[PDB]
From a paper:
The primary function of major histocompatibility complex E (MHC-E), evolutionally preserved in humans, primates, and rodents, is to present a short peptide from the signal sequence of classical MHC Ia molecules (VL9) to NKG2x-CD94 receptors expressed on natural killer (NK) cell and specific CD8 T cell populations. Yet, in specific circumstances, MHC-E can function like classical MHC Ia by presenting antigenic self and foreign peptides that are recognized by T cell receptors expressed on CD8+ T cells (Hansen et al., 2016; Joosten et al., 2010; McMurtrey et al., 2017). Here, we characterized the biophysical and structural properties of HLA-E∗01:03 in complexes with intermediate-affinity pathogen-derived epitopes, comparing their structures with HLA-E-bound VL9. Finally, structural analyses revealed an altered configuration in the HLA-E α2 helical kink region primarily involving E152, conserved among structures of pathogen-derived peptide-bound HLA-E but absent in published HLA-E-VL9 structures.
The HLA-E∗01:03 heavy-chain extracellular domain and β2M were crystallized in complex with the HLA-E-restricted mycobacterial epitopes IL9 (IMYNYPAML) and Mtb14 (RMAATAQVL) (Joosten et al., 2010; McMurtrey et al., 2017). The HLA-EIL9 and HLA-EMtb14 crystals diffracted X-rays to 1.7 Å and 2.05 Å, respectively. Unusually, conformational peptide dimorphism was observed for IL9, which adopted two distinct configurations in different non-crystallographic symmetry (NCS)-related molecules of the asymmetric unit. One such configuration, in two NCS-related molecules, closely aligned to VL9 peptides. However, an alternative conformation in the two remaining NCS-related molecules, featuring adjustments of the peptide backbone at position 7, resulted in divergent trajectories of the A side chains. In the alternative IL9 peptide configuration, the Cα atom at position 7 projected 2 Å further toward the solvent relative to VL9. This arrangement led to the secondary anchor side chain swinging away from its corresponding E pocket. Given that HLA-E-bound peptides including IL9 commonly participate in crystal-packing interfaces, such structural polymorphism may reflect weak tethering of the position 7 A side chain to the deep secondary E pocket, rendering it susceptible to crystal packing-induced repositioning. More specifically, the E152 side chain in HLA-EIL9 and HLA-ERL9HIV complexes protruded toward the N terminus of the peptide-binding groove and mediated inter-chain hydrogen bonding with the hydroxyl group of position 3 Y. Although VL9 peptides contain a highly conserved position 3 A that projects into the shallow D pocket, E152 repositioning plus the hydrogen bond formation with the position 3 Y side chains of HLA-E-bound IL9 and RL9HIV redefines what can be accommodated at the position 3 anchor.
Numbering used by the authors:
A (entry chain B): 1 to 100
B (entry chain A): 1 to 275, 277
C (entry chain P): 1 to 9
């Protein structure tokens, strides 16, 4: 039974401008098995109505998924992605950095 | 240029929770155009690209019947594999299948793939000769013998070389306005000082299609790079992709570095430097 | 379109 831990990127669809509607993305890739839990957080609270793409996989058989939600970035609001997988002892949290 | 039609099928057994989960996705190039998910009372193959709504009910009924049947075959295959490996029914196992064809610039068949994986590892692969198989262990050798008994390689050739090629041409015609439109990257360089002595130069490429791209930080031979980082190409969520490459350089040497961006949508490669 | 009937493993 192979196990591959997810690579995680948190980012926006468009360059973030304060006060303008945008989309917050959490891209998880390179993981196996396919079971995985991903939540987007605003100031630590789970964002509802978060959709995700259809399960697909790469040439090396590892899976990838995109989780996304509409958002409007502000100066002080903190956004993050919380990912849980069999390879993670505890759910991993990655903060959104508008320059990455 | 070249084009591809590819299907990706995943089946995951669920101990004590009923039949295995089964998900199929289809791609033309880097564009998903169909999906099937058996987690429904009446699961259907559905479009995932708007131009596929040009297809009538006959198309969707046929694909729905094929996907429902394929899910049943994978349930049988998971049961068979469990027996090959003397595995208990209490463990969840994964069977994956990728298949499809690539067209050359002439619209003719270029290459085909048919590959199975069990629990994340290669299991049975059709070689590029489209007549021999690669089995990874003694279990896969049984599957190989069954495929040879059933002349599966010749049935694969007929699909990969004809049926697959014919339908890739049809999909490329139905979605030509988006599938054949190259979207060049929008590029810029950002600057992020780390300390008083070092800074990060980040080269951005945003909103490009297709996903293939090359981002390279070049230097004039007098640059002393402290660190580099290149993230995986990621989907923007609107059908296009993003990527960036960063270098950590000593403050004052920023102008010795040049970001080189190559993409099919650019008439010629672009070069960027950090100008405050 | 999808391939019909991959031979059983």
């Amino acid at each position: 039974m192979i196990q591959r831990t997810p690579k995680i990127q948190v980012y926006s669809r468009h360059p973030a401008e304060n006060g303008k509607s945008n989309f917050l993305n959490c891209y998880v890739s390179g993981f196996h098995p396919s079971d995985i839990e991903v939540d987007l957080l605003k100031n630590g609270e789970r964002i509802e109505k978060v959709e995700h793409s259809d399960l697909s996989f790469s040439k090396d058989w590892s899976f990838y998924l995109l989780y996304y939600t509409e958002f409007t970035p502000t100066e002080k609001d903190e956004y993050a992605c919380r990912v849980n997988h069999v390879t993670l002892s505890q759910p991993k949290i990655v903060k959104w950095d508008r320059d990455m | 240029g070249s084009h591809s039609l590819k299907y990706f099928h995943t089946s995951v057994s669920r101990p004590g929770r009923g039949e295995p989960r089964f998900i199929s996705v289809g791609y033309v190039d880097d564009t998903q155009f169909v999906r099937f998910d058996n987690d429904a009372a009446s699961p259907r193959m559905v479009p995932r690209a708007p131009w596929m709504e040009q297809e009538g009910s006959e198309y969707w009924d046929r694909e729905t019947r094929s996907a429902r049947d394929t899910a049943q075959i994978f349930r049988v295959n998971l049961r068979t594999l469990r027996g090959y490996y003397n595995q208990s029914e209490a463990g969840s196992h994964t069977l994956q299948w990728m298949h499809g064809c690539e067209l050359g610039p002439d619209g003719r068949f270029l290459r085909g793939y048919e590959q199975f994986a069990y629990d994340g590892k290669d299991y049975l692969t059709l070689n590029e000769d489209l007549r021999s198989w690669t089995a990874v262990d003694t279990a896969a050798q049984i599957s190989e013998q069954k495929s040879n008994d059933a002349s599966e390689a010749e049935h694969q050739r007929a699909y990969l070389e004809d049926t697959c090629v014919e339908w890739l041409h049809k999909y490329l015609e139905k979605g030509k306005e988006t599938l054949l439109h190259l979207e060049p990257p929008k590029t810029h360089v950002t600057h992020h000082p780390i300390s008083d002595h070092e800074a990060t130069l980040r080269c951005w490429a945003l909103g490009f299609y297709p996903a293939e791209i090359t981002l390279t930080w070049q230097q004039d031979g007098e640059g002393h790079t402290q660190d580099t980082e290149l993230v995986e190409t990621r989907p923007a969520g609107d059908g296009t992709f993003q990527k960036w490459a960063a270098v950590v350089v000593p403050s004052g040497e920023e102008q010795r570095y040049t970001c080189h961006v190559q993409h099919e949508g650019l008439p010629e490669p672009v070069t960027l430097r950090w100008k405050p | 379109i999808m391939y019909n009937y991959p031979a059983m493993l």
